[PDB]
Amino acid sequence: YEHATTMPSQAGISYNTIVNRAGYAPLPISITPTKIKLIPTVNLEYVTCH
Amino acid sequence: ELTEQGSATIHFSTANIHPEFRLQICTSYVTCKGDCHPPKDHIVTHPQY
């Protein structure tokens, strides 16, 4: 079974959904984002000091 | 098996999406209706009953 959903990007707030087959018991799904990290690809150009 | 009062469960296999049949018991003719749903498995390992 292929299920699709869209969870808002907000850490610390759970996202609860349910998967209902036509004739089978519902399946509960919960996603809890504890941290969402965005890491850019950085390359060093130079270093400066006094 | 049959008792004085209660509920009895019967396992049946149907190909009807909306089944409605006349279940015959010791003497009565109960009318049974409902709705069925497509199964999980695309392919199984036994012939259809």
From Swiss-Prot, chain B:
Protein's cellular compartments: Virion membrane; Host cell membrane
Posttranslational modification: N-glycosylated.
Signal peptide residues on this chain, from the entry's feature table: none
Membrane topology listed for this record: Single-pass type I membrane protein
Domain of life, source organism: Viruses
Subunit composition and interactions: Interacts with spike glycoprotein E2. The precursor of protein E3/E2 and E1 form a heterodimer shortly after synthesis. Processing of the precursor of protein E3/E2 into E2 and E3 results in a heterodimer of the spike glycoproteins E2 and E1. Spike at virion surface are constituted of three E2-E1 heterodimers. After target cell attachment and endocytosis, E1 change conformation to form homotrimers. Interacts with 6K protein. Interacts (via fusion peptide loop) with host LDLRAD3 (via domain LDL-receptor class A 1); this interaction mediates viral entry to the host cell.
Cited function: Class II viral fusion protein. Fusion activity is inactive as long as E1 is bound to E2 in mature virion. After virus attachment to cell receptor LDLRAD3 and endocytosis, acidification of the endosome induce dissociation of E1/E2 heterodimer and concomitant trimerization of the E1 subunits. This E1 trimer is fusion active, and promotes release of viral nucleocapsid in cytoplasm after endosome and viral membrane fusion. Efficient fusion requires the presence of cholesterol and sphingolipid in the target membrane.
Record-given protein name: Spike glycoprotein E1
Lineage: Viruses, Riboviria, Orthornavirae, Kitrinoviricota, Alsuviricetes
Span covered, complete protein: 1157 to 1205 of 1254
